[PDB]
Amino acid sequence: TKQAPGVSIITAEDIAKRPPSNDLSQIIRTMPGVNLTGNSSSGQRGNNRQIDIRGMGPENTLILVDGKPVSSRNSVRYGWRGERDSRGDTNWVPADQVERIEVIRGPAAARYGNGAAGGVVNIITKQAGAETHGNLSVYSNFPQHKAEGASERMSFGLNGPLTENLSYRVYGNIAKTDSDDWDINAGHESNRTGKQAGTLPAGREGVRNKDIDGLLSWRLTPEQTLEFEAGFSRQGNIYTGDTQNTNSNNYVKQMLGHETNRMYRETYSVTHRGEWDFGSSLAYLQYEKTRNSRINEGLAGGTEGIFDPNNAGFYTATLRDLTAHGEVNLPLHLGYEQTLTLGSEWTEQKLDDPSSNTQNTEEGGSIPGLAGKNRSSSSSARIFSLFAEDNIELMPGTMLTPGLRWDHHDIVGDNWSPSLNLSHALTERVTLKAGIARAYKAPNLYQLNPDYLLYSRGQGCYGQSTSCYLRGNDGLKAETSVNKELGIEYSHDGLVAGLTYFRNDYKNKIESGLSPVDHASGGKGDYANAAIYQWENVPKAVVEGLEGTLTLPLADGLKWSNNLTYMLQSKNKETGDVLSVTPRYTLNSMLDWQATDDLSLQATVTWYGKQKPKKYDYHGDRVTGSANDQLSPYAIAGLGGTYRLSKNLSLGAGVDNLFDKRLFRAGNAQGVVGIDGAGAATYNEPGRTFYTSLTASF
Ligand SMILES: C#CCNC(=O)[C@H](CCCCNC(=O)c1cccc(O)c1O)NC(=O)c1cccc(O)c1O
Ligand SMILES: [Fe+3]
C-alpha cells in the first residue's frame, strides 16, 4: 500500500490522476503529516509556501532527488523571521519524469541526519529499461479568473541501452507559471494609511523552468554498476510586487512582470552501485552549484527584503555544495535474523553572498568585532558523519531497527543522533509501529555567521522600541528533536485503516534572540548605541498531532482513499507563540472510478481546518485588530479523468476548485506603522481552474 505508519509513497500513476500545475509541493502536501507552510509565523513571503512535515517547518524537510540532497534554497538570504524569498526545492524535477516520491516522517527519517528533523522527501526519476522507452508530456491549465496565473508544461524522457553493459536516460522540461496580476489582492488588503497608502500584498510569483538531465549507467561487471549524471536547471521568476513587509517603492513597480530573481542549478553526480555474495554496496559524489542572481535588497527594518533603489542592479550568491556518501548492507544469520548497514557521509557547503553581509553600522553605532564595511562574503561548513542501521527480525513480521548516527560539524561540534524503530504484527492484518529518535539540525550559514547583520530602528526589536542589530552567532548549538511516534494500521485486500500519534520534543530551535547580549557605540541621534541581539537557541519547543489514512474498495472498479493530518500543538515553550501556521486539520479524499478498461475518473475533496496567527508581535507584545484575524475552515473539490486512446497515447482533463472557493493575501500577520496586519490571511488560494494533458509514450 501507499501509506504505512510514518511513510507515504506517491506513484507515477498518482501524479497523472492529480496533475500538478508545475511544482510537486501541490501533490506532496496531500500525504498524511505534510502541510504547505512558511518556516516561522511572520507571514513574510507567505505566497512562497514549502513542504512542512509534522509542523517542524520546511527547513527541517530534507529534499532528495534519487537519494542525493538538494541544497539550492540555502543560497537565498535567511531573514530575521526565519523566511527566505525562495519558492523552495520541490520544483527542480518535472512532474511527468518522476517515477515515484517517498515521504519519510519523524523517527524513521532521523537516520538521514542533517535537516531531517521533520522528515525526508525523496523524488525518484524514471530510469532506462531492458529496451529503449520514451515519453512526451504536455499540461496546460485555464483559470476562471484572469488575475490568477495559468501554467503550461512540456517534458520529454528518453532512455534505453547503448551497449549490453551501457544504459542511458535523458529528460528535458520547459514550463511557465504566469504570476498573479499585481492587483489580485486589491480590496482584500489590510488597512494601509500614511506613507504606506496604496501598498499591496502580492499574489503568487510566476516562474519559468528549463530542466535538462543526462545519465549514463555502466555495469562494467556482473555485480558492479557505475552511473554518471549531470543536471542543468534554471528558474527565472515573474515579479508581482511581493516584498518582505508589503511596503513599496518605485523600483518594485518598475519590475512588475520582469525577472527579478534567476536560480541556475547545476548537478554532476558519480554513483557506483555494488551487489555480491556478502551483500550490497552504494557510494556517490554530488557537486551541486547554485547561482542565485537577484536584485539587491535592503537589510534594515522595513527596508529588509525590498529592492534597494540606491544600489540598483543584480548581485549573484553562489552555493557550491559537495556531497559524498558510502554504505554497505550485510545480511547476518545469527541467534536473531537481521540486516546490518554501515555508512560514512561527507558534505561541504561553500556560500559566496556579496550582498547579505553589507548592513553598515553608521546609524546604530559600531559593534566591537564586526567591521562596518567590506566584511567577508564567504561562509562554509563541513559535516563528517558515520552511521550503522541494524534491521533485526526478532520473529517473522516483527522488525526492530536500532541505528546510531554521529556527525562532526567543523564549527558547532559533535552530534549523537540515536534511533529505534519497531514494527509488530499483532495479526496478519494489523501492525503496531513505535519509533523514538533524536534528529539533527545544523545551523544554516546565515544563522552561524558573525558578519551577517540586520538592523531595525525599533519596530522589529524584542522587548523595547530602541534601534537594535541582529547578528550571526558561531557559538550556536545544533537543533535536536526527540521525534516520538506510536501508530496502528489494519491492511487487508486493499482495505487500509491507520492512525498515528506523533510528538517531536524540539531542543535549541534557532531563532532571532529575545535579550540584548550587548550594545553598539556611536551612530546618529535617538538610534545611537543600538542593542545587539544574536541568533539564539530556544531551550524547548513541542509539536504534536495525528496522521490518519482510510482506504475502502467500494466495488472492484471503485476506490475511496482518505489521508488525515490533525495538528494538536505547535509551541515555542519560551514565548508560548506558535512555530508555524498550519491548518488545525487536513482531510484529502479521492474517489477513483476505473469506469472502463480505458477510462478512469477521479473526484477529490480537501478540507482545511481553522488557521490562527501568532499572538505576539516582533516586540513580544500582544497583537490587536486585524492582526488577530483567523481563516475559517474551507474545502476545495476537484473532478478529473484520463481517457487512454491507445498504449501510446493518453489524454487528461479536469477542474481544480469546482466551487471557486478563493482566498487572498491581505499582507503579513502583524501590524506595522501604516500597514495593519492580516493575521492568518497571508496566502492566495486559487479559484476554479480547468486543465488538459496529453502523454505519448513507447
Ligand atoms: C515610514 C518610515 C520609516 N522608514 C521607512 O519608510 C522604511 C519602511 C518601514 C515601513 C514598514 N516597517 C516595517 O514593516 C518594519 C518591519 C520590521 C522591522 C522594522 O523596523 C520595520 O520598520 N524603513 C526604513 O527605512 C528603516 C531604516 C532603518 C531601520 C528601520 O527599522 C527602518 O524601518
Ligand atoms: Fe523600521
Q: What residues make up the domain containing 689?
A: 1-697
* Alpha-carbon span 72 to 233, nearest angstrom: 11
Closest CA to 175 of 304, 20, 25: 20
What DSSP assignment string belongs to 310-373?
A: GG-SEEEEEEEEEEEEEEEEEEEESSSEEEEEEEEEEEEEEEE-TTTT----TTT-BBTTB-SS
CB of 101 closer than 8 Å to CB of 342: no
| CA atoms 112, 113, 117, 118: torsion sign | negative
The strand pairing partners of 498, in sequence order, are 489, 549
For residue 140, the cross-strand partners are 152, 692
State in Å: Cα 461 to ligand 2 middle.
9
- Which residue is closest in CA terms to ligand 1's atom 7? 302
What single letter denotes the amino acid at residue 214? G
CA–centroid distance, residue 302 to ligand 2 (Å): 5
Cα 538 from chain centre? 22
Q: At residue 395, what are phi and psi to the nearest 5 degrees?
A: -130, 140
Cβ atoms of residues 190 and 677 within 8 Å = yes
Residue 140, burial from CB neighbour count under 10 angstroms (0-12, 13-18, 19+): middle
Which residues have C-beta atoms less than 6 Å from ligand 1?
Answer: 195, 245, 247, 300-303, 455-457, 459-460, 672-673
- Residue 619, phi-psi category: left (phi > 0), alpha (psi -120 to 50), beta (remainder): alpha
Q: How many domains does the chain have?
A: 1
Ligand nearest the Cα of residue 670 is 1
Whose CA is closest to 452, among 330, 355, 348, 592?
Answer: 355
Q: Going by CA atoms, what residue is nearest to atom 5 of ligand 1?
A: 302
Distance of CA 624 from the midpoint of ligand 2 (Å): 19
Q: Report every protein residue that has its C-beta within 5 angstroms of ion ligand 2.
A: 301-302, 457, 459
* Minimum-distance ligand 1 atom for the alpha carbon of 668: 14
CATH number at residue 562: 2.40.170.20
Measured from the Cα of 363, ligand 1's closest atom is 28
Region of 112 please: left (phi>0), alpha (psi -120 to 50) or beta: alpha
User: Taking the C-alpha atoms of 488, 491, 496 and 497 in order, what is their torsion angle to the nearest 10 degrees?
Assistant: -30
- To which residue does cell 472510478 refer? 593
d(CA 598, CA 584): 39
> Angle at the Cα of 43 (from 37 to 48), degrees rounded to 5?
50
Q: How far is residue 140 from each of residues 73, 135, 645, measured CA to CA in Å?
A: 27, 17, 19
Whether 307 contacts 255, CB under 8 Å = yes
Rg (CA), the chain: 25
Which among 553, 633, 643, 549 is positioned nearest to 591, based on CA atoms? 553
Q: At residue 194, what is the residue type?
A: G
Q: 187 CB contacts (<8 Å, ≥6 apart)? A: none
Q: CA-CA distance, 546 to 653, in Å (whole number)?
A: 34
Grid cell for residue 694: 496529453
Q: How many CA atoms within 13 Å lie on the side-chain side of 353?
A: 25
Under a CB-based contact definition with an 8 Å cutoff, are residues 518 and 458 in contact?
Answer: no
Give, in order, the Cα–Cα distances in Å from 447 to each of 78, 450, 520, 568, 678.
8, 8, 20, 29, 28
| Secondary structure of residue 626 in the 3-state scheme | helix
- Parallel/antiparallel/unpaired status of strands 468-471 and 531-555: parallel
Choosing from 363, 453, 454, 456 the residue with most ligand 1 atoms within 8 A of its CB, the one to mutate for a pocket test is: 456
C-alpha cell at 124: 525518484
Q: How far is the CA of 473 from the centre of ligand 2 (A)?
A: 23
Q: Interior CA angle at 599 toward 595 and 605, to 5°?
A: 70
Is residue 543 within 8 A of residue 55, CB to CB? The reply is: yes
Could you tell me which residues come within 8 angstroms of residue 299 by beta carbon, excluding any fewer than 6 positions away?
356, 358, 359, 453, 454, 455
Residues 105-138 as b or e (16 or more Cβ within 10 Å = b): bbbbbbbbbbbbbbbbbbbbbbbbeeeebebebe
Q: How many CB atoms are closer than 10 A to CB 333?
A: 7
- Between the CA of 303 and the centroid of ligand 1 the distance, in Å, is 6
- Cα–Cα distance, 442 to 414 (Å, whole number): 11
Separation between Cα atoms, residue 614 and residue 33, nearest integer Å: 21
Phi-psi region of 80 (alpha: psi -120 to 50; beta: other; left: phi over 0): alpha
Distance 440 CA to ligand 1 centre (A): 35
Which residues have C-beta within 8 Å of that of residue 674, sequence separation ≥ 6? 192, 193, 194, 195, 196, 197, 199
State which H helix or E strand residue 17 sits in: helix 12-17
Among 246, 297, 303, 673, name the best residue to mutate to test ligand 1's pocket (greatest count of ligand atoms within 8 A of Cβ): 303
Q: Report the distance separating Cα 387 and Cα 111, nearest Å.
A: 8
**How does DSSP assign 258-287, residue by residue?**
S--EEEEEEEEEEEEEEE-SS-EEEEEEEE
Give the ranges where 43-169 is alpha helix by DSSP (H).
Answer: none
Please classify residue 414 by burial: count the beta carbons closer than 10 Å to its beta carbon, then call 0-12 exposed, 13-18 middle and 19+ buried.
Answer: exposed
Q: Whose CA is nearest to atom 6 of ligand 1?
A: 302
Grid cell, residue 579, equals 512555530
Method: X-ray
